[PDB]
Design a protein around this nucleic acid. Structure first.
Length: 265
DNA sequence: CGTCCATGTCTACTAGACCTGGACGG
């Protein structure tokens, strides 16, 4: 679900589809309320890139494919349970909501956006969501600037643990990353955001917003039962024995150690 | 059987709503 997983999903799409050629239409499950993808091509390649908590697929017709198609872009958010899988055409997982079909010569495969709870969404248009800040993984300096330029924003009145989830400034950070980040600096989660970002204008909190998710990207994995164990072995705080936890203002669990901090409930 | 919990938004009147499924309680 978080920035590293989106990033790994987009590497997965790029690598797994490196030698695939897709054809035909793009199929959506009936249950899915996201929009139909009007795209048909006899021969196209798929590629991807990630930005924070979004992923962009590009569908690219080979030369001379028919019908006529200019490339198409789609932007995915995963919600709580999204992923991409490459599977045998007739062995679709349950909840594969959007499906791209390889073309012949070779084994009939399907690239699927798989999403159990259907919190994920896509849009037509390759446009990043307006409002999202820069990617903490891939656009670090922009990300860092955008936070420091904007400390007056009322978002920074909130505890630091809540501010870290705001995708306008922390695009890519989610519930496990906020615990892991805060925990490396032993910053109380209910310290006030502005105070912690008002005295830093030895990695600092904004640097870890980049390097911590980068560590995850570097474990590789997220199924892209063995890889989940490397991840579990990497977590130091989120869900771990001996840690405290509390409910933030929006009912989400913050894991931490020690001082809850002045704005605690 | 039931309750609770989960890597996020999204929406409409901060408190649900939107979903499925696994762990675990009786």
């Amino acid at each position: 679900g978080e920035g590293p997983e989106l990033h790994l999903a987009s590497q997965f799409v790029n690598e797994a589809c490196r030698a695939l050629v897709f054809g035909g239409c793009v199929e959506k499950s009936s249950v899915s309320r996201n929009p139909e993808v009007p795209f048909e091509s006899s021969a196209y390649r798929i590629s991807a890139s990630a930005r924070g908590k979004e992923l962009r697929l590009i569908l690219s017709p080979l030369p001379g494919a028919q019908p006529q198609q200019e490339p198409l872009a789609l932007v995915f958010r995963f919600g709580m349970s999204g992923s991409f899988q490459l599977v045998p055409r007739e062995e679709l997982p349950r909840h594969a909501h959007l499906r791209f079909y390889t073309a012949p010569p070779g084994p009939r495969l399907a690239l699927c956006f798989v999403d159990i709870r259907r919190f994920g969404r896509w849009d037509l248009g390759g446009k990043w969501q307006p409002g999202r800040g820069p990617c903490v993984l891939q656009e670090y300096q922009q990300f860092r600037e955008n936070v420091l330029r904007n400390l007056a924003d009322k978002a920074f009145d909130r505890p630091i643990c809540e501010a870290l989830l705001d995708q306008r400034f922390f695009n890519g950070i989610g519930n496990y990353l906020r615990a892991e980040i805060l925990y490396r600096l032993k910053i109380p989660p209910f310290e006030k955001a502005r105070s912690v970002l008002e005295a830093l204008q030895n990695p600092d909190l904004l640097e870890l917003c980049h390097s911590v998710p980068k560590e995850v990207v570097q474990l590789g994995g997220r199924g892209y039962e063995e890889d989940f164990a490397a991840f579990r072995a990497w977590l130091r705080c989120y869900g771990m024995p001996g840690m405290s936890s509390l409910q933030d203002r929006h009912g989400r669990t913050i894991w931490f150690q020690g001082d809850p901090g002045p704005l605690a409930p």
